[PDB]
RNA sequence: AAACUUUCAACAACGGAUCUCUUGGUUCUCGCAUCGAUGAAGAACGCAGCGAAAUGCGAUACGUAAUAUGAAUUGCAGAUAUUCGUGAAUCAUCGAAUCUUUGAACGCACAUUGCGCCCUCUGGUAUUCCGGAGGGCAUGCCUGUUUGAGCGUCGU
RNA sequence: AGGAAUAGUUUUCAUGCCAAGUCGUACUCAUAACCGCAGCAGGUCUCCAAGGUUAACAGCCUCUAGUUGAUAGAAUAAUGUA
RNA sequence: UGCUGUAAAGCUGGGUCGAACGGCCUCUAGUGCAGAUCUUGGUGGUAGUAGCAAAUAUUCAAAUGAGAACUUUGAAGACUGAAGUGGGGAAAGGUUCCAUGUCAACAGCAGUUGGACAUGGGUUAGUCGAUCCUAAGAGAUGGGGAAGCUCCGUUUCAACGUGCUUGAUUUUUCAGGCCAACCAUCGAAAGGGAAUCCGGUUAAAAUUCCGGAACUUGGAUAUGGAUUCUUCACGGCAACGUAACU
RNA sequence: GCGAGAGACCGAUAGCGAACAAGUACAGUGAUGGAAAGAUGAAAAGAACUUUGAAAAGAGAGUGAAAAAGUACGUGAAAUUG
RNA sequence: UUGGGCCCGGCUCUUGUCUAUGUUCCUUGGAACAGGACGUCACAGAGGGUGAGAAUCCCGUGCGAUGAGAUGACCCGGGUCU
């Protein structure tokens, strides 16, 4: 995940099973003040689910990722 | 199958969580009767019956 | 420990809103530092903190509407007493009450007398 | 060729799980599955067949509202709130 | 004569009898009357700082409030947790709440986490398109309201 | 039905603007991942298909790819099996 | 270790052991085993025996390791021989995938190896499917049977539209008009069906990610063009042509 | 069903199938079928340390009233075996 | 011969608080709850716990005492106004 993070600009989060991807994309802007590009979700094995957030080039998602806290 | 529904998928996961030994922490509270875990499951012995 | 529910009960319903947001904010923080200590006993407080907060709005508001259907004929089914399902449809006690005419007339008229023998 | 090269065509499931009870029994078919009879109103069961009502009966879930009516009971179905002592 | 075999004894095995017990069963008696559309019983899936069960609980998730009580919990760890006290622990008590997806199971459907419609609020330049939040739309029958149909029928 | 005189089209002509939800997606598919109580010589639907010989997608040899798995060692009576 | 009794049995010495138990007078019973191809559990002889022989076939060296016929690398000898022992899928399984550790049990020899065991990681879609359509068929509804669970009917002896269009009016009310033969619903991961390709990238995902290049549907809406004073375009004998062209 | 009190009852192959994570594990497409399994010690004091071994383990030591109680744990019969 | 509206009690139910007398000496034992001696209480010598058979160590048992609440057209005992 962090791979993808210095990549490719994007965030990866779990998220409520229950959620689409505008919920997502509303609610990281409503939490953390940035803009998706896209949003890419996958229920996991275990039976939870992530989402792949690509943020717009307004954002890099390293200082996003380091400003959240868990780098 | 790769070709599953989501109550299929879902079934499967909760089958994942409870192929897991004991905590080993378990064992040393006070009056433990569990030494192990006694409900495992492997898949090619015991199949789901899904 | 955590908040306490007798001052909860003092604060307005825009100021439980605005705590409850900051306690969703921590308890987001402390699951991502969660990540990495791993172990954060803080985390039962602040899920508790949450319930409690939650509780006291929702006990506000259910206060309200019960002020705002009292002695009403019609009042939501959730603040209508709630027996069991026989008991309420029992006859109330007025209806269970009812006489005839005819019946009040032989009762007023033949009580049951008080008496002793032996005199 | 009746035993175990024909147990290798078996790949077809009859039934699969049932909504309400949960067993896989629901047969795909007809719809209706052999252990309680959904969709049916009622429950399937038989006094013929006295342990299958011991497997799935009242007490043998988890009855989150039944547990507490004889407790309401006892207590006259109370309505309101306790009191602080004095 | 050894080896081998057979019998006994000792010790060691194998195995789990015997003896002692017992938060279980079984029978008898005494007392009580309380499930559900105000959504039951049952099902599924989740929930703990570290848990797979059992037990408890429902996104307020091994629990929230309240009443009582009065110093624990404990396997380890740990308060921005506590002690002459609005105070530790407590399914002690329990009258206030929460109560996912379902289920008689109720918008339609269900081998799908499929598809409508109505109202209020709200985002995208929007009565129509796309999105979010909240609240609604089953059947049989009763009483009533309202809007109606029939040269069935009265009068003018 | 509606449309001109200094005015409506028409997005079935060009260019430009916005958006596209939900669930599945790993891996095996078989002389060991399926069913036959098992890592059982059984059973279980289908797509792709090189060179030589040849009537031939048969048999026999080969390239790409893949395997080299199946308890092993020493001897080689009788009676077997092939 | 002995003693008593014809006997059923009773008592005692020594060892082991750890929490209750016996004589006598009576009461009571789920009260005495060698057998029942008895029941459950346990254990032998057989016996280190039958056997571990289909699918051409293995060998040298090094590395690793306590340990190597069986692991890894190199060399070689072979085979499947494209109707495969190759490369993918449907059904079914459900984490077996991948990396790291790892050998008690399992892999009917072995094991440093493994589909085993342990800890983690891993499945990204407007364009691929499902989803939608109907197929044989299944099945609600006014209803007609049946004591009833329910059976029958679906072009179903029925007052069966959660209708639609405009002129707009805001007043969320109207004004009309047009029809209602048919249409609950379920039924295909091979039938029908809107639209995506190439290159690259991981330990393990990719028509899903990255880079580039497109397409479809739904909507909004501006510019340019086209059309109209012969109002709703011209050309070609024609087949027909066109950027448009109520 | 809820709350109690009892017995010339059974005592882990008995007594309910279940005294235990029992309607569990497991089987069957399904209706259904359905076990086994209680006891170290007062207290884990659950054997520090040395030594042989690749290790499992052994030998010393140690704790305990007892290790003739070592989580293969009360006693520990018989068949069978050294 | 006389209806009704209410207050307090009783009864009924639920529930809080409170309670006698050895841990004296000797022996055995790891442990005294065993045996011996001397006692105590007893309307309490039921039962359980605690390192072995515990009335007297703990909880209870027996006996009472004293409070809080709820409910009752359809239970009764007195009072109040029409
Ligand atoms: C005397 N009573 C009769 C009554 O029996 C009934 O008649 C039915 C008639 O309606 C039916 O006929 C009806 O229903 C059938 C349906 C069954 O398929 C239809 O095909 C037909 O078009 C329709 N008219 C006829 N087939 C039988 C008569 N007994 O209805 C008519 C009536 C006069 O009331
Ligand atoms: C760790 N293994 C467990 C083990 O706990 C076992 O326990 C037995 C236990 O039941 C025996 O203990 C027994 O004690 C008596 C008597 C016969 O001894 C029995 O009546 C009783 O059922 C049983 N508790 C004990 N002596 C040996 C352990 N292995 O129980 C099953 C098991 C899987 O073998
Ligand atoms: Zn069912």
Same mark, same amino acid.
């Given at each position: 995940?962090?791979?993808?993070?210095? #990549?490719?600009?994007?965030?990866?989060?779990? @998220? #409520?099973?229950?959620?689409?991807?505008?919920?997502?994309?509303?609610?990281?802007?409503?939490?953390? #003040?940035?803009?998706?590009?896209? @949003?890419?979700?996958?229920?996991?094995?275990?039976?939870?689910?992530?989402?792949?957030?690509?943020?717009?080039?307004?954002?890099?998602?390293?200082?996003?990722?380091?400003?959240?806290?868990?780098? | 199958?790769?070709?599953?529904?989501?109550?299929?998928?879902?079934?499967?996961?909760?089958?994942?969580?409870?192929?897991?030994?004991?905590?080993?922490?378990? !064992?040393?509270?006070?009056?433990?009767?569990?030494?192990?875990?006694?409900? !495992?499951?492997?898949?090619?012995?015991?199949?789901?019956?899904? | 420990?955590?908040?306490?529910?007798?001052?909860?009960?003092?604060?307005?319903?825009?100021?439980?809103?605005?705590?409850?947001?900051?306690?969703?904010?921590?308890?987001?923080?402390?699951?991502?530092?969660?990540?990495?200590?791993?172990?954060?006993?803080?985390?039962?407080?602040?899920?508790?903190?949450?319930?409690?907060?939650?509780?006291?709005?929702?006990?506000?508001?259910?206060?309200?509407?019960? =002020? &705002?259907?009292?002695?009403?004929?019609?009042?939501?089914?959730?603040?209508?007493?709630?027996?069991?399902?026989?008991?309420?449809?029992?006859?109330?006690? &007025?209806?269970?009450?009812?006489?005839?005419?005819?019946?009040?007339?032989?009762?007023? =008229? &033949?009580?049951?007398?008080? &008496? =002793?023998?032996?005199? | 060729?009746?035993?175990?090269?024909?147990?290798?065509?078996?790949?077809?499931?009859?039934?699969?799980?049932?909504?309400?009870?949960?067993?896989?029994?629901?047969?795909?078919?007809?719809?209706?599955?052999?252990?309680?009879?959904?969709?049916?109103?009622?429950?399937?069961?038989?006094?013929?067949?006295?342990?299958?009502?011991?497997?799935?009966?009242?007490?043998?879930?988890?009855?989150?509202?039944?547990?507490?009516?004889?407790?309401?009971?006892?207590?006259?179905?109370?309505?309101?709130?306790?009191?602080?002592?004095?």
């Amino acid at each position: 995940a962090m791979k993808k993070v210095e #990549d490719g600009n994007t965030l990866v989060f779990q @998220v #409520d099973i229950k959620s689409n991807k505008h919920q997502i994309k509303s609610a990281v802007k409503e939490l953390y #003040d940035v803009d998706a590009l896209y @949003v890419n979700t996958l229920i996991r094995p275990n039976g939870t689910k992530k989402a792949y957030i690509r943020l717009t080039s307004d954002y890099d998602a390293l200082d996003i990722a380091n400003r959240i806290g868990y780098i | 199958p790769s070709q599953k529904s989501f109550r299929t998928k879902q079934k499967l996961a909760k089958a994942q969580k409870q192929n897991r030994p004991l905590p080993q922490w378990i !064992r040393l509270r006070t009056d433990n009767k569990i030494r192990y875990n006694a409900k !495992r499951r492997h898949w090619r012995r015991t199949k789901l019956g899904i | 420990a955590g908040v306490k529910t007798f001052e909860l009960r003092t604060k307005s319903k825009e100021q439980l809103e605005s705590q409850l947001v900051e306690l969703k904010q921590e308890l987001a923080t402390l699951k991502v530092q969660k990540l990495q200590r791993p172990s954060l006993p803080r985390i039962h407080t602040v899920r508790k903190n949450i319930a409690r907060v939650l509780t006291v709005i929702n006990l506000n508001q259910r206060e309200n509407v019960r =002020a &705002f259907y009292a002695g009403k004929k019609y009042i939501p089914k959730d603040l209508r007493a709630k027996k069991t399902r026989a008991l309420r449809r029992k006859l109330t006690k &007025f209806e269970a009450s009812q006489e005839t005419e005819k019946a009040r007339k032989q009762r007023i =008229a &033949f009580p049951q007398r008080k &008496f =002793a023998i032996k005199a | 060729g009746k035993g175990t090269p024909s147990l290798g065509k078996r790949h077809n499931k009859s039934h699969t799980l049932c909504n309400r009870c949960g067993r896989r029994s629901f047969h795909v078919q007809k719809k209706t599955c052999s252990s309680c009879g959904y969709p049916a109103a009622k429950m399937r069961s038989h006094n013929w067949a006295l342990k299958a009502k011991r497997r799935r009966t009242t007490g043998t879930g988890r009855m989150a509202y039944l547990k507490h009516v004889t407790r309401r009971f006892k207590n006259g179905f109370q309505t309101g709130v306790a009191k602080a002592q004095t």
